Design a protein around this ligand. Structure first.
Ligand code: ADP
Lengths: 101, 152, 412, 81, 91, 107, 94
């Protein structure tokens, strides 16, 4: 039924297709995302955010309750080395009580 | 409480007298708005249709529409439709203004927003207590980069 | 101010040239809903010096009994939607062209010819055209091809099995031509029903509606100055029409040419200010919804034909996007096209956009350099003895030319 | 419920059409007629109420509507006024 | 056959009584009055004066629509024949 | 002299209510449908581009600037406060012109 | 030259507050029609020219309704039977 979801992405620098884990697609549906939305995916963490509807669809109705954003001028895909600092106290706190979840 | 963060944000705000509003049974519908200096008609989308109908917006109201959010604020009725309370004149200038709002949040008021599944209740109700010092260690450092990236 | 046009050239010749080896120099002729373009091939020379009859393909006659008004000096033209669909004006057009090119002695057209046809040509139109070409004119052998594939054949790196897209534009159309190893993939070629005539008629109608003081003084023959010399195509349309929104940009960048002259006079002999208007007539082929008519336009058609194909054959063909014909003359055309293409390619992938060496003339020079090489390919040309059995719908699928479909037409 | 003006029945509108002398009636005509029928009351009841609101009565009289019909150029006999 | 409707024409042109059902018309009159203004109530004679004006007005509209369709070389009416009959009257 | 002194009767008649021109394009792409066409063919009916998949942008009729608005009366689309004052002064002969230039809801 | 841009008339006869019938022939038209009810008439210039303004406005108002009647009746061409429709449905040809 759902091994994965293919998703297609576009920016002013080009396009990619990605093969999403069903847990990430469950997050796309959490954010109420549909084709023609502008999305940020953080593939190392599974964070997903709707930035807004893409402004190529800004004339789909004359007045509708969505905010439209310009097609991103940035790359479709970006990499960095990042270095995370976490204290033993952050572990002692975040694992002791049941999380908010 | 006594050190402020200040930011500015730009919003597409629509303001005017509603001249006429129409709806159908998905859905489609049509709206008209007026200022002292222009008029328009508009095709509405579904999330607006549900908002206008939920909030009983009626021809002759003077209204502000938060275009980013679908929220409606009604200011009163036009004096020419005050017959059959609060009454007010139409806005001046164009309907859709890209208004700039400057806003300020006390540095502590960012801590309380961060503390709970809804933070801001604890701001008023006084449930803010022993706020975890590692959260302040992050927020002070986050505001210290907004200060220099120039976004705040 | 505006200039005005000029006419009555000197294409007056002896009965024809002669060249070494086989004596019959072929004629090279382009049809054209805007202008016909013609000449003797001038074989053995690379810098082909004299294309002739480079003329607006529109005609009349003196109805009081004077003369046929075929050449340059209300009006009718032998084409509709870039296909010839006429006889009674097509005859006097061809006769006029053959008078100035010369005919060797008598009532037959002696030399073989190469002639342009539409990206796809309706079978009946080729039948009527070949019937004029062999019943009336009696040519010994004939070749057919497309302006866009000829101008590509002129601009190729080598005389080889190249592949690409050809992007074409002209009076009533633009076409997107996927070519795979020299073969046009006619099953997924596409066209938009807009171009030079629509842009000129639109720019006219804007100035008719915006300046009702000059309604007879503005006309297409004045629109062609502002359209081919004062207009430009945006690198990104909402970005250009955004910067036209502030008066300090507008008043410095606006074009301002006076009408022909005799209240500070300009209410009658206006500067006809154009700023966004000098962008709108260009944009029509990118956004045909600037007119009423709904079609995809060049950006969405270019995307639509590419996703018909496996991802490798896309990358090896999109290496040669070629711009030719008509509206591709606008300044900034490559810079728009490569941006619209960057927005739809896979993220790291390479592509290249090539603009013709002369976007109006290269179809003739292409057909010329083609005929110079294929001169004695006796299997390629439609021979008069083949038209003696083939009904006139017929075509042979040679390089840089249209795809024949096996078919037969009833006629009586 | 039937309050959508469909309470003005198909065969009643068709009988008005038959008195009006029309032959074949396309199936959208009944609803187009109900649109006109509303708008005629949005003229006539509305102005008749402006005559009821001259006296500011609760009862609409036949006079009140005859005055509205008189200013709207469609006078009526038998009721008087 | 598809044409004996021509006998209905003659019957409903011989007839001269009101054709819409009184209760439906009275309900509609009251509903349009009550969403317009509060506590408006109608004498039977006012509802009858309304209904006679309405049905005479619609007989006029149908006569006008007949001439529009006859002019269009039809024997049928479509909503466009009514929309001409409005715009040509200025309605 | 003349490339020929005599000429064929290609399909146009000498006389009659019939044409002197051959069939116009609209009759050609109709009559050509009777032929044994197939799903793989270079068929001239198939080459016209598809409809636009995205909804079309709106640009103001009178100046080409981006249109936030449409007038309830004339149904033209406009951008600015002085453009709204301008359009309400225009004659119907240009209002219908701008509407026709975009095949509008009144043609 | 021939057979093009009929809008040359549209673009000429409505650029200003002009009237389309010439003054001398209109002034001798009205007087013959007037005297049949009662003769020995004399006329103010301001009386006769108040007739033409109403006449041309009414004629223009008819033609405005008339071309839509042709379009509805499947024509681009206006013909006398369009006026038979329009002037009767306005209630005037009765
Ligand atoms: N400057 C120009 N402006 C407009 N159209 C042009 C121009 N130059 C060439 N054309 C166009 O070229 C198009 C196709 O090439 P053309 O040279 O005319 O040969 P053909 O019609 O046989 O294909 C025509 O539709 C014609 O309008």
């Amino acid at each position: 039924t759902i091994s994965h979801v293919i998703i297609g992405l576009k920016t002013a620098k080009g396009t990619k297709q990605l093969k999403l884990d069903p847990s990430i697609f469950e997050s796309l549906q959490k954010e109420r995302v549909e084709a023609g939305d502008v999305i940020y995916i953080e593939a190392n963490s599974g964070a997903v955010k709707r930035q807004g509807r893409c402004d190529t669809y800004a004339t789909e109705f004359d007045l509708e309750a969505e905010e439209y954003v310009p097609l991103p001028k940035g790359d479709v895909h970006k990499k960095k080395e990042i270095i995370q600092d976490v204290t033993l106290h952050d572990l002692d706190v975040a694992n002791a009580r049941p999380q908010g979840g | 409480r006594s050190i402020g963060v200040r930011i500015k944000e730009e919003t597409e705000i629509i303001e005017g007298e509603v001249v006429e509003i129409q709806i159908d049974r998905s859905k489609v519908g049509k709206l008209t708005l007026k200022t002292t200096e222009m008029e328009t008609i508009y095709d509405l989308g579904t999330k607006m249709i549900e908002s206008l109908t939920k909030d009983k917006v009626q021809a002759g109201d003077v209204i502000t529409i938060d275009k980013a959010t679908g929220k409606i604020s009604k200011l009163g009725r036009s004096f020419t439709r005050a017959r059959d309370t609060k009454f007010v004149q139409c806005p001046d200038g164009e309907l859709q203004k890209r208004k700039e709002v400057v806003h300020t949040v006390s540095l502590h008021e960012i801590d309380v927003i961060n503390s709970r599944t809804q933070g801001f209740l604890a701001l008023f109700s006084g449930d803010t207590g022993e706020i975890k010092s590692e959260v302040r260690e992050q927020i002070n450092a986050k505001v210290a980069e907004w200060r220099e990236e120039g976004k705040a | 101010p505006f200039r005005d046009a000029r006419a009555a050239p000197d294409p007056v010749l002896e009965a024809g040239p002669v060249a070494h080896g086989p004596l019959p120099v072929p004629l090279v002729l382009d049809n054209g809903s805007f202008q016909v373009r013609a000449g003797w091939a001038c074989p053995g020379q690379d810098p082909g010096p004299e294309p002739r009859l480079q003329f607006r393909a529109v005609c009349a006659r003196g109805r009081g009994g004077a003369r046929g008004a075929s050449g340059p000096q209300m009006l009718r033209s032998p084409f509709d939607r870039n296909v010839p669909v006429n006889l009674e004006l097509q005859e006097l057009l061809l006769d006029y062209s053959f008078q100035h090119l010369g005919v060797s002695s008598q009532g037959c057209v002696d030399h073989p010819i190469v002639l342009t046809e539409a990206v796809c040509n309706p079978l009946y139109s080729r039948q009527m055209m070949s019937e004029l070409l062999f019943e009336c004119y009696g040519i010994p052998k004939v070749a057919y091809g497309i302006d866009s594939l000829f101008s590509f054949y002129h601009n190729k790196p080598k005389n080889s099995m190249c592949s690409g897209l050809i992007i074409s534009s002209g009076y009533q159309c633009t076409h997107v031509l996927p070519i795979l190893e020299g073969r046009l993939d006619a099953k997924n070629c596409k066209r938009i029903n807009l171009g030079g005539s629509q842009a000129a008629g639109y720019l006219q109608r804007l100035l008719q509606l915006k300046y009702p003081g000059h309604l007879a003084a503005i006309t297409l023959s004045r629109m062609e100055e502002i359209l081919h010399e004062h207009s430009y195509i945006a690198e990104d349309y909402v970005e250009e029409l955004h910067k036209w929104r502030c008066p300090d940009y507008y008043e410095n960048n606006v074009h301002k040419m006076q009408l022909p002259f005799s209240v500070f006079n300009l209410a009658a002999y206006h500067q006809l200010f154009v700023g966004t208007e000098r962008i709108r007539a260009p944009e029509i082929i990118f956004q045909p919804s600037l007119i009423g008519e709904e079609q995809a336009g060049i950006a969405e058609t270019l995307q639509y034909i590419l996703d018909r194909y496996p991802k490798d054959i896309q990358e090896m063909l999109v290496q040669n996007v070629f711009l030719t014909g008509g509206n591709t003359m606008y300044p900034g055309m490559k810079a728009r096209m490569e941006k619209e293409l960057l927005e739809m390619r896979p993220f790291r992938s390479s592509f290249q956009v090539q603009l013709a060496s002369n976007p109006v003339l290269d179809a003739w020079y292409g057909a010329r350099d083609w005929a110079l090489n294929h001169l004695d390919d006796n299997e390629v040309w439609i021979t008069r003895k083949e038209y003696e059995e083939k009904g006139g719908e017929y075509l042979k699928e040679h390089c840089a030319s249209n795809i024949y479909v096996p078919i037969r037409l009833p006629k009586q | 419920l039937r309050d959508n003006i469909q309470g003005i029945t198909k065969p009643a509108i068709r009988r008005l059409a038959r008195r009006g002398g029309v032959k074949r009636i396309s199936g959208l005509i009944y609803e187009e007629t109900r649109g006109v029928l509303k708008v005629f009351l949005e003229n006539v009841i509305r102005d008749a109420v402006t005559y009821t609101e001259h006296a500011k009565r609760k009862t609409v009289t036949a006079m009140d509507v005859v005055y509205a019909l008189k200013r709207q150029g469609r006078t009526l006999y038998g009721f008087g006024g | 056959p598809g044409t004996v409707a021509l006998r209905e024409i003659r019957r409903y042109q011989k007839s001269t009584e009101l054709l819409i059902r009184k209760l439906p018309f009275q309900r509609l009159v009251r509903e349009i009055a009550q969403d317009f203004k509060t506590d408006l109530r109608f004498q039977s004679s006012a509802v009858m004066a309304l209904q006679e004006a309405c049905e005479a007005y619609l007989v006029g509209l149908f006569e006008d629509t007949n001439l529009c369709a006859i002019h269009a070389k039809r024997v049928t009416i479509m909503p466009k024949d009514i929309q001409l009959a409005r715009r040509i009257r200025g309605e | 002299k003349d490339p020929n002194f005599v000429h064929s009767g290609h399909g146009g008649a000498v006389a009659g209510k019939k044409n002197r021109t051959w069939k116009n394009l609209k009759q050609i792409l109709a009559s050509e449908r009777a032929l044994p066409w197939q799903l793989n063919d270079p068929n001239y009916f198939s080459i016209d581009a598809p409809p636009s998949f995205k909804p079309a942008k709106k640009y103001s009729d009178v100046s080409g600037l981006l249109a936030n608005y449409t007038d309830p009366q004339s149904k033209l689309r406009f951008s600015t406060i002085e453009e709204f004052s301008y359009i309400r002064r225009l004659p119907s002969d240009v209002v219908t012109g701008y509407l026709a230039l975009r095949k509008a809801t009144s043609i």
